[PDB]
Amino acid sequence: MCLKLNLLDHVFANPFMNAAGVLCSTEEDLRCMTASSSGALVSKSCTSAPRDGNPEPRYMAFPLGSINSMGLPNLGFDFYLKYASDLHDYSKKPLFLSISGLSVEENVAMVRRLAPVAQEKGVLLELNLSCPNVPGKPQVAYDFEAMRTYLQQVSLAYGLPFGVKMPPYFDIAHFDTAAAVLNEFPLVKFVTCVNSVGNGLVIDAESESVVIKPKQGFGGLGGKYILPTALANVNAFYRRCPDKLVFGCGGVYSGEDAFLHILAGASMVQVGTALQEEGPGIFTRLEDELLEIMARKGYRTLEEFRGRVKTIE
Amino acid sequence: MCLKLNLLDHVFANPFMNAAGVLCSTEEDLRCMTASSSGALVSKSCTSAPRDGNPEPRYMAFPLGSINSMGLPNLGFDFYLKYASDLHDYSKKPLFLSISGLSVEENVAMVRRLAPVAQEKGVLLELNLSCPNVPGKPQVAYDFEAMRTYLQQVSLAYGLPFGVKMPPYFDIAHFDTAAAVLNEFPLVKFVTCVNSVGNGLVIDAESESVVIKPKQGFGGLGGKYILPTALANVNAFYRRCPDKLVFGCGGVYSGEDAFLHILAGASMVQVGTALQEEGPGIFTRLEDELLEIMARKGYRTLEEFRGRVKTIE
Ligand SMILES: Cc1cc2nc3c(=O)[nH]c(=O)nc-3n(C[C@H](O)[C@H](O)[C@H](O)COP(=O)(O)O)c2cc1C
Ligand SMILES: Cc1cc2nc3c(=O)[nH]c(=O)nc-3n(C[C@H](O)[C@H](O)[C@H](O)COP(=O)(O)O)c2cc1C
Ligand SMILES: O=C(NCCO)c1ccc2cc(CCc3c(C(=O)O)[nH]c(=O)[nH]c3=O)ccc2c1
Ligand SMILES: O=C(NCCO)c1ccc2cc(CCc3c(C(=O)O)[nH]c(=O)[nH]c3=O)ccc2c1
């Protein structure tokens, strides 16, 4: 009875990892994720230049989830590239590096420089597409032209297996369209569903105030709020992309949640808010709980139930 | 101290009503909603001919919310028109009538016929824009040209103040765009934010099965999942539509949830899932709890804090 998996030519002790953005910004964070019993880790989404990000407060959490508008604070590509090439310990677990350049040219620049480290060290690329392009255009993934563009250019510049981080979708035509676009690109080997549910508003009743400072308090939502959304999107893409892997992200707090993500078709399972709230010790709980569910049901491997959600009739 | 209000030339005992879809399909349903404490009622979205809708099970609810894919079952427009014409007791409360035709033609044909009853009785039209189109093109609200067409055609045929039911948006550019369209139409006096959060999927861990039979288990989400989403949209439309009323829908289980909807800008507050779950008694509780918050803060009127949510700095 085990949680092991081989995929994209790497071996993983278990399906669990942090979500990009959570506990992965500094050397200190990365070293902690690495010492944890997560199956893998992903670095904070970076830009070329170091960024300070938005004014604080900019993240907040509550019993049923979180809201954030961090504005992409990170130490700069050079920092994460050096961490990938010089400091990370691959014998402990695989590394993902998430890039989130503010234009297609910034993304091409970084990936060209990432390629040789990817080849030499085996670091994996997660391209963040649930990012802004020009203001007053939808973020990149809600704009299938822009998305096609970024993917051709990044496939050309990088020329290696990478994966993509998707915002959630809510309409069948969008699922149909976005999957068709993704299927045009043999090198997109994996799809992460989903990024935060965009522009929610949390209001505090005692103070009659929004709880984060940027954007008049509008920010991305994570946690329990988003589980059924995360599952629909995992399962939509798992059904429409028979040749790609789906990574589930969204509202995982328990093994049962991880179990549901996996029945929906998830290969890896990421943890954002719950990790932020609970700290890296969460990873041992998640594993035990999922293993308990598997034992009770007679499952021995993840592949026995992955994608095996049943419909009625 | 009390909660009465005046809008669109009708008096309301309080700002609560059912959401379209819930306890509003048969004559028995509507008679019950009328005998409740709700300030108003809306009828089930209707089509010209009666519909059986989707295979059961087609609705399910859980502690954090609900999922449905009813498929628009209804007794047909003749029935709801006759209810609006001859059966409804307007001395008890205002009535809204929701129409949700499958094409613009079906919708224009309904409204020409409803126009004279509206004149004569004062029934109000809620145009459901959050419906199929589910052929090959996105649904109407997520397709701004189709949205402009239905609005032009309908305001032509109806020629009276009416309102539109909106699905949620998740992007600043879409709020800017959707809002600009609605502002093209002086006859649209109210915007209801929001309809169910489209296409989530609820999987049950024990039986490893989806919970509803149509659309392979995919359906609209209501309840506690959607509250911060319902509040971002109320407030995004509140700020961008200064000449329109905003009606909040989504995630109301308490006086507090209603309070936050109003702080966000809502004038009427709609209850769906919580009503389906607790029954019409919910209105007396919500009234009380909302009056209780007001008293503790020394607010006398909804007008005092409607829309007056604070941002930081
Ligand atoms: C503080 C914070 C920072 C985040 N940063 C990123 C990021 O840099 N890149 C990214 O792709 N997603 C980011 N996310 C979204 C998470 O990666 C994840 O997609 C989302 O929070 C849903 O997961 P959860 O439900 O487990 O929180 C961030 C989320 C939070 C709460
Ligand atoms: C069983 C069911 C039927 C519904 N039918 C309709 C409908 O016919 N027309 C409509 O505009 N919305 C319909 N809705 C959406 C609700 O009006 C409301 O927008 C949504 O449930 C979110 O509100 P809540 O969080 O209070 O449930 C329905 C919802 C449910 C649960
Ligand atoms: O300028 C911004 N925000 C306020 C001004 O409009 C801004 C800039 C870059 C951003 C970049 C992202 C992508 C990184 C990211 C963030 C994040 O760092 O804010 N939060 C998420 O939940 N998901 C994400 O993918 C999200 C929001 C951003 C907002
Ligand atoms: O046949 C349908 N679905 C199965 C796949 O085509 C179908 C047909 C008409 C529909 C019409 C609507 C509009 C009514 C509605 C419903 C509803 O009655 O299903 N549920 C909601 O949460 N919000 C709504 O606005 C919603 C879903 C529909 C699905």
Swiss-Prot record, chains A, B:
CDD domains: DHOD_1A_like. It is an enzyme of class 1 (oxidoreductase). It is found in: Cytoplasm. Substrate binds at residues 44, 68-72, 128, 133, 195-196. GO terms for biological process: 'de novo' pyrimidine nucleobase biosynthetic process; 'de novo' UMP biosynthetic process. It catalyses: (S)-dihydroorotate + fumarate = orotate + succinate. Its cofactor is FMN. The active site is at residue 131. Optimum temperature is 37 degrees Celsius. FMN binds at residues 20, 44-45, 128, 165, 194, 223, 250-251, 272-273. GO terms for cellular component: cytoplasm. The keyword Cytoplasm applies. SUPFAM superfamilies: FMN-linked oxidoreductases. Catalyzes the conversion of dihydroorotate to orotate with fumarate as the electron acceptor. Molecular oxygen can replace fumarate in vitro. This is Dihydroorotate dehydrogenase (fumarate). The gene is pyr4.
